[PDB]
Design a protein around this ligand. Structure first.
Ligand SMILES: NC(=O)c1ccc[n+]([C@@H]2O[C@H](COP(=O)(O)OP(=O)(O)OC[C@H]3O[C@@H](n4cnc5c(=O)[nH]c(N)nc54)[C@H](O)[C@@H]3O)[C@@H](O)[C@H]2O)c1
Length: 252
């Protein structure tokens, strides 16, 4: 076929098999998630979007999945990120210094995957899925991520960290999931400080990007919520990762 329904990529090939194998892998590795039955997890995931108009998905559709994937994360060890997923994950890989959402069962199941169904049909749509901008925002992927990102922000306490891409037009973007959802769902009764790490993509020296207009916006939004704001430049992401792997000795 030469003309698809939606303007975005279709469900990832072997989506059922992949979600299930990820659930097996995760539950075998993480002892706290040993009680999880993976078929019922798959079934709840499936029940959220199958037979449903892929432009009419709600947070409620994902409630059975949220329940089965319930998980305690150390509240003071949360790492948020925005436009810098690779470094965030390489970082938390080193010695579980922290957790990203993709280190939870639910985030781990869905990471890098696309999925949608069809109204009045129980088929998975492997040909196309709604683009969140071109088509509609209430689609299975977008709704999933909004819901889990929010619950993950709500679980944080004490010092929360966020990695930001210092080479973006807007280092902090109000229209990102981080800026539109997570910053507004950090709980001021629990969260003492939001500390931003601004990751330089820029060669060598470079500016004090903690002074960037968008970082000041972030500071201002967070301060008006009664949460403290902290910022640090990461001038050389290569040296940072090395220092995390091997603290001191090296000129860290
Ligand atoms: N792992 C993920 O794919 C993912 C997707 C969406 C959200 N997250 C969580 O929010 C933060 C990252 O989201 P965000 O700040 O939007 O950063 P990015 O722009 O790099 O988002 C990653 C992808 O999510 C896609 N995506 C899909 N739907 C949307 C949407 O409705 N609004 C929106 N802003 N982005 C969307 C988008 O096209 C990107 O491909 C971070 O703390 C994660 O824990 C993670």
């Amino acid at each position: 076929r030469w003309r698809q329904t939606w303007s975005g990529p279709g469900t990832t090939k072997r989506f059922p098999e992949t979600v299930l194998a990820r659930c097996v892998k995760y539950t075998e590795i993480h002892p706290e998630m040993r009680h999880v039955d993976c078929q019922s997890v798959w079934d709840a995931f499936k029940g959220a979007f199958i037979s449903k108009h892929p432009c009419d998905i709600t947070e409620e559709d994902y409630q059975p999945l949220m329940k089965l994937g319930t998980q305690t994360v150390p509240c003071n060890k949360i790492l948020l990120w925005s436009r810098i997923k690779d470094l965030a994950h390489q970082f938390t890989q080193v010695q579980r210094d922290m957790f990203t959402l993709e280190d939870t069962l639910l985030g781990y199941l869905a990471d890098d995957l696309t999925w949608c169904g069809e109204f009045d049909t129980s088929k998975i749509n492997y040909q196309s899925c709604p683009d969140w901008r071109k088509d509609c925002s209430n689609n299975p992927v977008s709704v999933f991520w909004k819901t889990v990102s929010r619950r993950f922000a709500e679980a944080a306490c004490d010092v929360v960290h966020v990695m930001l891409d210092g080479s973006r037009s807007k280092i902090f973007d109000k229209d990102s999931t981080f800026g539109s959802v997570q910053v507004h769902n950090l709980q001021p009764e629990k969260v003492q400080t939001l500390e931003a790490w601004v990751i330089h993509g820029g060669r060598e020296d470079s500016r004090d990007l903690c002074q960037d207009p968008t970082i000041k916006e972030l500071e201002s939004i967070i301060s008006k919520r009664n949460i403290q704001f902290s910022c640090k430049n990461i001038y050389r992401p290569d040296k940072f990762l090395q220092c995390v792997k091997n603290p001191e000795d090296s000129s860290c």
